[PDB]
Amino acid sequence: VTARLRPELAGLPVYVPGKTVPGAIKLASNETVFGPLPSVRAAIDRATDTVNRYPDNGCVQLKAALARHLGPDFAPEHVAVGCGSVSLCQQLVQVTASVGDEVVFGWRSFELYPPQVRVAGAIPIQVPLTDHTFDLYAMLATVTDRTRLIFVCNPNNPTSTVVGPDALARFVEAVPAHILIAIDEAYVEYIRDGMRPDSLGLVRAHNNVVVLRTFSKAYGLAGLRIGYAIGHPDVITALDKVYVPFTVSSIGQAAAIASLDAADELLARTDTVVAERARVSAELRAAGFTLPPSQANFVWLPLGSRTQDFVEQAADARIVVRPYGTDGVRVTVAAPEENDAFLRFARRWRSDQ
Amino acid sequence: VTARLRPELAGLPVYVPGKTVPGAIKLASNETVFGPLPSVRAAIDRATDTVNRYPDNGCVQLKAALARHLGPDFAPEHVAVGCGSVSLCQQLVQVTASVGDEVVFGWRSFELYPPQVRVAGAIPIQVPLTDHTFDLYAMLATVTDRTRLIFVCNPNNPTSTVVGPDALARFVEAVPAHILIAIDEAYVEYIRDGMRPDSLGLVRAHNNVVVLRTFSKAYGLAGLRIGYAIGHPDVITALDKVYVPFTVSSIGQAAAIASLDAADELLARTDTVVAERARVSAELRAAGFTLPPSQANFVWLPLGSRTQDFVEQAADARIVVRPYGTDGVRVTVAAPEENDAFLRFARRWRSDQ
Ligand SMILES: Cc1ncc(COP(=O)(O)O)c(CN)c1O
Ligand SMILES: Cc1ncc(COP(=O)(O)O)c(CN)c1O
Numbered sequence: 001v002t003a004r005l006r007p008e009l010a011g012l013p014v015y016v017p018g019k020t021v022p023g024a025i026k027l028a029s030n031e032t033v034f035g036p037l038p039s040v041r042a043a044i045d046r047a048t049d050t051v052n053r054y055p056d057n058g059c060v061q062l063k064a065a066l067a068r069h070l071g072p073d074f075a076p077e078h079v080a081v082g083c084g085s086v087s088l089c090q091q092l093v094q095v096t097a098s099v100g101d102e103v104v105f106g107w108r109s110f111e112l113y114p115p116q117v118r119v120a121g122a123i124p125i126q127v128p129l130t131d132h133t134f135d136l137y138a139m140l141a142t143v144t145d146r147t148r149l150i151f152v153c154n155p156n157n158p159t160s161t162v163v164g165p166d167a168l169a170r171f172v173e174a175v176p177a178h179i180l181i182a183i184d185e186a187y188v189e190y191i192r193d194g195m196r197p198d199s200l201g202l203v204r205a206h207n208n209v210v211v212l213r214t215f216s217k218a219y220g221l222a223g224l225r226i227g228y229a230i231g232h233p234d235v236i237t238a239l240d241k242v243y244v245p246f247t248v249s250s251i252g253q254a255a256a257i258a259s260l261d262a263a264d265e266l267l268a269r270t271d272t273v274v275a276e277r278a279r280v281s282a283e284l285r286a287a288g289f290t291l292p293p294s295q296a297n298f299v300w301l302p303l304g305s306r307t308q309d310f311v312e313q314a315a316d317a318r319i320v321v322r323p324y325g326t327d328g329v330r331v332t333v334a335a336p337e338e339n340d341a342f343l344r345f346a347r348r349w350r351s352d353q
Numbered sequence: 354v355t356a357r358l359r360p361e362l363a364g365l366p367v368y369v370p371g372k373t374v375p376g377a378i379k380l381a382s383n384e385t386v387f388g389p390l391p392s393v394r395a396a397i398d399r400a401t402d403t404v405n406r407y408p409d410n411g412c413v414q415l416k417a418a419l420a421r422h423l424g425p426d427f428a429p430e431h432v433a434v435g436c437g438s439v440s441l442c443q444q445l446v447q448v449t450a451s452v453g454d455e456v457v458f459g460w461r462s463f464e465l466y467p468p469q470v471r472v473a474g475a476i477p478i479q480v481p482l483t484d485h486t487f488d489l490y491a492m493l494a495t496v497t498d499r500t501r502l503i504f505v506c507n508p509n510n511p512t513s514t515v516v517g518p519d520a521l522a523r524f525v526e527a528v529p530a531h532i533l534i535a536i537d538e539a540y541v542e543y544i545r546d547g548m549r550p551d552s553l554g555l556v557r558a559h560n561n562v563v564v565l566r567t568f569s570k571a572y573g574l575a576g577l578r579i580g581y582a583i584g585h586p587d588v589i590t591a592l593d594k595v596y597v598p599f600t601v602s603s604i605g606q607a608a609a610i611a612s613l614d615a616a617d618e619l620l621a622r623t624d625t626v627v628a629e630r631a632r633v634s635a636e637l638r639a640a641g642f643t644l645p646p647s648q649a650n651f652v653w654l655p656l657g658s659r660t661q662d663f664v665e666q667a668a669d670a671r672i673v674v675r676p677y678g679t680d681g682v683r684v685t686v687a688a689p690e691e692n693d694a695f696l697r698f699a700r701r702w703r704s705d706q
Contacts, residue, residue, distance in 0.1 A: 003533040003561035004501070005448050005591050015598045017410040026406075035402050044401050044604070051389050051397075051576035051608070054382050054569075057370040083436055083578075083600045090597055095358050098474055099452050112598065119595055121451055121474075148357070178357040208356035216407075223404035223603035238358050242472055244443055245368045245465070247436045250576040251397075251604055255404065 013115045018322050021315065027332040027342060028322040030157075030187075030298050032220045032273070036255070037265070040221075043258035047251040055250040058240075062253045065260045066228055073204060078230055080239040083247035085186055085214045085227030088239065089151075090116045092210070092229075095238040096148040096180050097122040104142055105151035106134035108158060108327050110184065113151055122148070132159040132292040132300060136171040149180050154197065155187040158322070158330040160294035165197035172202050172209055180235065183211045187296035189218035189270050190277070195295055200230065207232040217297060218270055219259040224252040273297050277333045280343065287347045302328040310349060317345045361474060366467045372673050378694050380685040381673040383510075383540075383651050385573045385626070389608070390618070396611035400604045408603035415606045418613045419581055426557060431583055433592040436600035438539055438567040438580030441592065442504075443469050445563070445582075448591040449533050450475040450501040457495050458504035459487040461511060461680055463537065466504055475501070485512040485645040485653060489524040496529065503528065506537040508544060511675070511683040513647035518550040525555050525562055533588065536564045540649035542571035542623050543630075548648055553583065560585040570650060571623055572612040577605040626650050630686045633696065640700045647686075655681040663702060670698045 018028035036044065063076040070079075082088035089112055097103055099121035105113050107126035117124040125147075127139045134152060143150075152171070155162050163171075168183075175181055183199055203209045210231035216222035226248060229239060259266060277294055284291060284299070291299050303310050304326060311323040319342055322330040333339060371381030389397070416429040423432070435441035442465055450456050452474035458466050460479035470477040478500070480492045487505060496503075505524070508515050516524075521536075528534055536552050555562045563584035569575040579601060582592055612619060630647055637644060637652070644652050656663050657679055664676040672695055675683040686692060 001530040001560065002585070002587055003449075004531040005533075005588075006451060008451075009448060009591055009594055012594050014594050015410075017407065017598060020409070029407050031406050034405055036404055040404075041401055044404075045394075045398070047576070048394055048397050049388050051393075052385050052387055052573040053373075053379075054370065054384065054575045055578075056373070057368075083597070087597050087600060094472055095362060096356075098359060098361075115594075119447055177354040180356040180358075207354070220405040222407045222599075223400070225408075225599060225602050232355070234355055235358075238362050241362055241365050241367050241468075244436065244440050245370060246575075246578060247440060247600060249578050249602060249605065252602065 008118055008121065012118055013111070015112055015115060019320050021320050024315070024318040024320050025338045025341060026320045027334055027338060028320045029222070030217060030296070030332050031222050032217060032269070032297070033335045034220055034269070036220065037262050039262060040255055040258040043254040044251050047254035051250065053250070055246050055248060055253060057245050059248055059253055062256055065257050069260050069263060070200065070230065073200070074230065077233045078236060080229040080236045080243070081248050082227045082229070082243065084216065084225040085184070085212045086112055087247060088212055088227045088229050089113065091239045091242050092149060092180065092182050093117055093120045093122070094242040100146065101148040102144060102146045103149045103151070104139055104147055106139065106153065106156065108324060109151070109153045110157045129159060132302065133161040134163050136163055136167055140171060140174055143176065143179065147179055149182065150175065151182050151184055153184040155191065155296040157186065158300055158324050158328070159292060160296045160298055160300045161292045162191060162195050162295045165195060168197045169202065172206055175208070177206070177208055179208060181209050183209065185211055186214045186217060188213065189267060190274060190297050191295040192274055203230055203232070207234070210235050215256050215259060219256070219266055221252070221255055221259060224249065224255050226252050226256045273333055276336060276339050280333055280339050283343050284346060287350050289346065289350065298330050298332045300328055300330055304328070313349055314345060319345055361471055365471055368465055368468060371675050374673050377671040377673050378691045379673045380687055380691065380695055381675040383570060383649070383685050384575050385570060385650070386688045387573055387622070389573065390615050392615055393608055393611040396607040397604050400607035404603065406603070408599050408601060408606060410598055412601055412606055415610055418610050422613055422616065423553065423583065426553070427583065430586040431589060433582040433589045433596070434601050435580045435582065435596065437569065437578045438537070438565045439465055440597070440600060441565055441580050441582050442466070444592045444595050445502060445533070445535050446470060446473045446475065447595040453499060454501040455497060455499045456502045456504070457492055457500055459492065459506065459509065461677060462504065462506045463510045482512060485655065486514040487516050489516060489520055493524065493527055496532070500532055503532060503534045504537060505534065507550065508540040508649040510539065510649070511653055511677050511681070512645060513649045513651055513653045514645050515544060515548050515648045518548060521550045522555065525559055530559070530561055532561060534562050536562065538564055539567045540570060541566065542620060543627060543650050544648040545627055556583055563588050568609050568612060572609070572619055574605070574608055574612060577602065577608050579605050579609040626686055629689060629692055633686055633692050636696050637699060640703050642699065642703070651683055651685045653681055653683055657681070666702050667698055672698055
């Protein structure tokens with residue numbers, strides 16, 4: 001006899017992380033390539049002095065720094081902080097959804113969403129993409145009385161694309177006002193070409209809109225786990241009710257504050273990533289690959305049934321890229337020498353096809 | 354109109370942390386008082402270089418070290434790691450309980466249990482203590498067909514006591530074998546007087562027993578959030594299914610590994626805390642305070658309706674102690690000079706009654 005566990009656990013689609021392989025360049029987790037700035041390193045060591053003490057459960061000084069960086073329309077009451085935006089995704093489910101409820105999102109999208117929804121006893125409504133892009137029209141139509149939460153992943157992980165900014169505004173305006181809408185903006189700092197939506201204006205104009213952002217990519221703290229949500233104080237308060245206490249570490253909070261102080265410097269680096277993104281995209285298309293327009297720090301190769309082969313052969317060339325079933329491969333844009341290694345491999349692989 | 358949130362959120366008993374008051378003596382969060390060893394800071398220093406990279410989702414190195422420390426009868430498959438044992442408490446609830454299900458625990462016990470149970474839509478069965486100690490007989494009598502999880506907090510937070518080690522074994526033997534029993538051993542390193550149970554023996558003897566331990570107290574890493582569970586590989590596999598990805602940070606893992614390597618030095622320090630505990634207990638009793646026999650790094654003062662006054666008066670003396678309703682005050686055993694400052698206050702307060 002064994003302990004009786006919940007029946008939902010069997011076949012639960014557990015999250016599978018990007019691999020780390022000795023000897024290989026990693027283009028599978030959308031990480032930026034630079035270690036911490038001197039001031040960030042200093043804050044980590046300063047926080048290390050008092051590691052025997054619990055963190056601030058409320059991340060008070062971080063919220064004050066985030067509110068200031070968000071501008072005059074936002075105060076700390078509009079900000080929740082979580083142990084990665086992955087934690088905030090679960091907290092959103094925990095404040096909205098229970099047994100038999102529905103959570104709507106585009107698919108393929110962040111692989112985190114389905115299992116977290118299922119843990120709540122709710123059902124994920126996975127709405128197909130159109131041209132590798134969230135289909136807001138289709139998502140709206142599938143709303144029912146039991147729809148408790150909607151995720152819009154923008155830019156989308158793993159397809160890299162963004163919806164039209166005006167289209168997003170129309171969507172939010174059309175959704176029944178009682179349904180929480182979470183706009184996942186993990187990659188927002190990489191959006192160019194006038195495609196960034198007025199996400200903060202949407203949270204101002206609508207009490208049911210919450211925006212998720214992260215320190216893991218542009219701010220370079222994927223190792224330390226700081227995500228934040230921007231929303232209406234009632235929603236922020238609810239998220240803080242289900243927050244697992246102390247999960248955002250002291251060192252994480254201090255490192256995040258120091259990163260905010262260096263934001264001009266850190267955000268300027270995204271311009272370089274975007275330049276490589278354009279170059280990687282141009283070279284891949286010149287080789288004969290087709291891929292959608294990326295607004296993130298990665299590209300999406302919809303290789304279908306060939307994704308497994310591409311990834312295995314990439315591994316043989318000491319390059320780690322990220323497979324998504326039989327849909328495609330997500331390739332991070334990183335250092336120029338890593339991007340060149342990937343491009344050389346990609347040309348060679350497609351020639352062999 | 355506001356976003357519709359779950360009804361269970363209204364009046365949820367949200368976890369209230371111990372206050373942190375700059376300039377005051379903090380005896381409110383059961384923290385140890387020493388900064389990290391140079392070897393631990395060095396491990397953090399090395400990990401700081403790659404904070405741009407995600408942590409190991411599987412905590413492979415840490416699990417291996419934990420399994421070595423647990424001895425020849427335990428391998429990594431018996432160990433789950435969480436972002437604090439507080440996260441593992443939620444994971445336990447997530448693998449066992451949903452709407453209508455029951456979770457039984459002694460009360461007063463860990464403030465964390467009721468809200469996490471309610472977040473699952475489950476029903477907390479709160480079984481009164483007897484002489485400030487878990488009443489295993491009464492808890493057994495409360496078991497039903499809907500009992501999905503049992504918490505035994507040993508030593509108990511906040512009352513500081515343990516049940517008899519044989520009584521614990523008999524309780525485990527008498528609980529129906531399909532019900533998961535979690536033994537919360539956050540303070541196990543402080544148990545003396547032959548009162549420590551054979552919890553690892555119980556795990557080996559029973560597939561439905563899981564033991565929770567932490568790096569936050571004896572190992573002095575409260576700021577960095579590492580807890581671990583020891584159990585049957587099926588339970589561990591299940592806990593890892595609901596684990597929020599990457600929540601145990603890269604720096605936390607490195608610090609925890611370093612702390613295991615320095616376990617002889619760190620564990621030896623528990624003897625000094627134990628000596629202070631006996632000393633403080635004698636000083637309080639001589640000053641007219643009754644208290645149960647503590648096996649933790651804190652004592653429990655069953656002040657009843659006077660706890661608010663005691664805490665307020667302590668606060669005015671620049672001493673932070675932890676109030677629990679109209680039941681009592683939990684006071685951490687910390688540095689000798691800090692304990693003496695508290696004792697001075699305690700004697701003063703006593704004389705004013
Ligand atoms: C859309 C999205 N949201 C959240 C996350 C998780 O980020 P964090 O490291 O802040 O948890 C990811 C990971 N790439 C993502 O793609
Ligand atoms: C019984 C018990 N369990 C778990 C915890 C949480 O410890 P951690 O810091 O590992 O989350 C505490 C905190 N005092 C506790 O008292």
